[PDB]
Symmetry: D2
Subunit: 203 residues, 4 copies
């Protein structure tokens, strides 16, 4: 709850080379995610009555929040939640293909990992402007591939995110420039499916 904290990456900024550059990892965590946490805190400071609430609860009830902080919480709260999930998913050393219960769900609803990789790529490439591509779970057991604009998080619509891929240009511009496709091809080498499995099971 408030005051929110910037989580440590938990690994060196250079750990994902040559897939994502150390310079991006550092700026992406310290400057972009850092700003989101600071701004989120700045917006909630004025309202003591909301200090005991988890960010996910704030995002599901955005319409209830005072009108002067709705946008600030959506943007920075979403920014904080998305990136926190992202750092965890990039943790080095985990399985490079789906495993466990998430694997079963994937093979059963999409056909196999190759089919899911095509849908998520199609979703990430298709998101015009800034946004995230996601594999989400709904309360009825169904998996969905979708994209959201800017820092919007699927929890706002009642989904539970399992995998999220950051497609804002700041995520890949320094190393890939306009080549978002090459950035997505590299992301598959670094996603930690054991972490995705933890997210799916708690889901």
């Amino acid at each position: 709850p408030y005051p929110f904290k910037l989580p440590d990456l938990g690994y060196p900024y250079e750990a994902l080379e040559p897939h994502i550059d150390a310079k991006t990892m550092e700026i992406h965590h310290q400057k972009h995610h850092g700003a989101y946490v600071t701004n989120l805190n700045a917006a909630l400071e004025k309202y003591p009555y909301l200090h005991g609430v988890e960010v996910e609860v704030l995002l599901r009830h955005l319409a209830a929040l005072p009108q002067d902080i709705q946008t600030a919480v959506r943007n920075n709260g979403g920014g904080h939640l998305n990136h926190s999930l992202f750092w965890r998913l990039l943790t080095p050393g985990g399985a490079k293909e789906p495993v466990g219960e998430l694997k079963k769900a994937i093979d059963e609803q999409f056909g196999g990992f190759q089919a899911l990789k095509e849908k998520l790529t199609q979703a990430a490439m298709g998101r015009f402007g800034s946004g995230w591509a996601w594999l989400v779970k709904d309360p009825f057991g169904k998996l969905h591939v979708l994209s959201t604009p800017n820092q919007d998080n699927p929890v706002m619509e009642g989904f539970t995110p399992i995998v999220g891929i950051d497609v804002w240009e700041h995520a890949y511009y320094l190393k890939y420039q306009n080549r978002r496709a090459d950035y997505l091809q590299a992301i598959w080498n670094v996603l930690n499916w054991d972490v995705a499995e933890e997210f799916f099971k708690k889901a």
Copy 2:
């Protein structure tokens, strides 16, 4: 859960005269609410996996529903939920002013019943086209006055409805025609605050 049922009014169609006419009460319940229940059921028939879900759960996760029934559930599910709350709120013989815990909340957040009546009237009058005016509760204890378009229900945004007022023209046209203001003046004579208190407490 599915198959949904049209609830009985629980009172004679003529019980609210001369405030709302018996002919409207009958058409409003049998034809309008009846159609919503039928259409809601028609849309869910194709998806066995959703047959054990309460309408409120369906409405909070609209984005998860198959794309071919999202609109049908929003419109008819919302229509079913709104009118079901409405018939209960019009039950004859209850308190004509807020009472109990809802009263305390009202006097504390709005100043008193007269101030709440001005905000809800302003909200009902201000809803252009079809819609509902509502007194809702959020998870943080705050009361809000808002209006929604068509058959949208505040649960879609994470609120719990306490009082809802139907401002579609079919609710007042036969007796009041274009005079929505006169219809709202009459509604205060028939709202059951003991029922509103039941809704608030379970909220």
Copy 3:
């Protein structure tokens, strides 16, 4: 331009019996349309620099209007324009089927009157809540059938309206109650296609 005036209806309130009742014609014209004109004028009253502009132009440039009157102009200016067209299209004494240049376009593009009636009926029935169904022309010479919510007029999006059918409940509730389909069957008996032809030629 400003000050806007209620147009004459042009024929006796009872001219369209038994298809549309006299009472509806009186209230629809004097009370509903009378209210839109009054409210539009009140909005524009505080902005002299907008006094010599036709309503079509204001609607095409809603985003440019002062912030405090954009909704008022969209809703009331749209209401004024929509009903002004409607009274003319209902003028007694014209062709009951498409004629002339509009007929050639309909035959070519939709296959004939029968196909268009069907499409226009589907658009009217499918407009949930308050709204209008339209046959419009775009700058490229193509015809489209679409519906708009509340009092939105298709000029807002660049189209030129040819035929508009009011589907707000006030347009049919006194005579038809919930039976919007019976109202639509009856409307074909009163449309004036010689008027539709002028709208088509002129744009």
Copy 4:
């Protein structure tokens, strides 16, 4: 009209150093804008009846375009028009402050260049995600400062663009990383106000 062409940039990629880096100018023009032109042409290729229309007209009539190409035209046609204006406004050798008729309008309406810089800076900084900040004119002779998301161009809403500043991360990431504010301070050093003056006169 179709086929659309990539406009010449007009000056060496390094002409705007040290304010905008040469590498950004090359990629922005050849790769980003080159992609928008290619994608726009591919969309319009299957619709000959739209071949002699200027891009401004297509954007004003998006709702009239075939359903399957509306997004493609909005995004790529908007991208083509936005950047075409941008290259011209960055032409070396013009006035660094407003001049002529546009200067009189700015002085009258905003109080002077200083006040406008401030307003334009606020709009650019406040555009969350991808977008553009603009100084536009409406048909009524008034100037507005606003921002649009992604590649939306203000002609979609009836405005005539005078000054547009690209705030997508690709416009500033190689040199400035997250520091959008430093990029905006630098942009004032390269804007060409003689060009802005022509855009203003011409509309």
